[PDB]
């Protein structure tokens, strides 16, 4: 989280938190009251947004469910949908957390090294998270959309 990111820098430089660092640590909490319902709203759709994004993604890329495709079969499709659910859970975790910490530390550092022995399309995950961000914002208002858009941008900005 933000506290972890600040304390890591402080301990790396061997010093207390800074006079501009506490101003950010306090501003990270005052919007937490609003943000709690923002990440909450995506929480009770978690088995629905991914379910719809399957219908947004494997018709866009039909080779994912074609004989030369990686997601042929009901169980193979289930794996891709479970991966989408994992990414949705992680992005919600980071939304509740602050900085990129929850997603980067768990399911972002080593995507290419995983898929290197997995044969799963990174350019397909690009559109997958594009559609996830596309469908997860209309549940929110524009005020919440402004507090949700950058949190969605990091996946398609990192895997690239």
């Amino acid at each position: 989280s933000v506290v972890l990111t600040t304390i890591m820098n402080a301990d790396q430089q061997l010093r207390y938190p800074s006079v501009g660092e506490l101003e950010q640590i306090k501003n990270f909490m005052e919007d937490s009251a609003l943000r709690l319902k923002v990440a909450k709203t995506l929480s009770d759709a978690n088995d629905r947004v991914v379910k719809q994004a399957s219908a947004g993604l494997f018709q866009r890329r039909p080779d994912l469910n074609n004989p030369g495709g990686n997601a042929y079969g009901e169980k193979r499709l289930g794996s891709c949908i479970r991966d989408l659910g994992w990414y949705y859970r992680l992005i919600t975790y980071s939304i509740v957390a602050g900085n990129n910490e929850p997603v980067e530390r768990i399911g972002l550092t080593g995507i290419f090294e995983m898929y290197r022995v997995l044969e799963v399309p990174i350019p397909a995950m690009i559109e997958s998270m594009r559609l996830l961000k596309k469908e997860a914002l209309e549940l929110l208002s524009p005020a919440e959309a402004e507090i949700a858009a950058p949190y969605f941008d990091y996946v398609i900005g990192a895997m690239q």
Partner: protein, 160 residues
Amino acid sequence: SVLTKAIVNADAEARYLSPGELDRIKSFVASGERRLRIAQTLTEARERIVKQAGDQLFQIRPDVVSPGGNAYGEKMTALCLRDLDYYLRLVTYGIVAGDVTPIEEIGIIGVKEMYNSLQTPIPAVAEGVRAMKNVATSLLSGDDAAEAGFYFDYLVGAMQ
């Protein structure tokens, strides 16, 4: 500043600006109006603040203005008041910047060596900064007084 501390931090990893960093930069630009107003209010009353802080300092530590004192004499006292004005200027710079980065480079790094060479009481200078903090917080509303005094306490802690 906050912008420098945020952009260069997301440049040491070869990534774009973090979705966690497309925030507190935001609160900084939001509170920039209040920061500018507070800095202007401190700047208008620079002479009165310096004069009263020097008065309080010379009462509380009268040994410095004695014959065996570093600041004994009219022009050695003028130099002490000039140093107090310098630190008030640095505090205003820190307030506008939103971080103690500029004040740190301008008037803190090596201050121990400089004052040891000149044979000046660093605890006396710290007490002068505290008196300046009291006089400054006497001229401001509670929130703005706390905001200015937080930087003043940074100066007091650093000169230590």
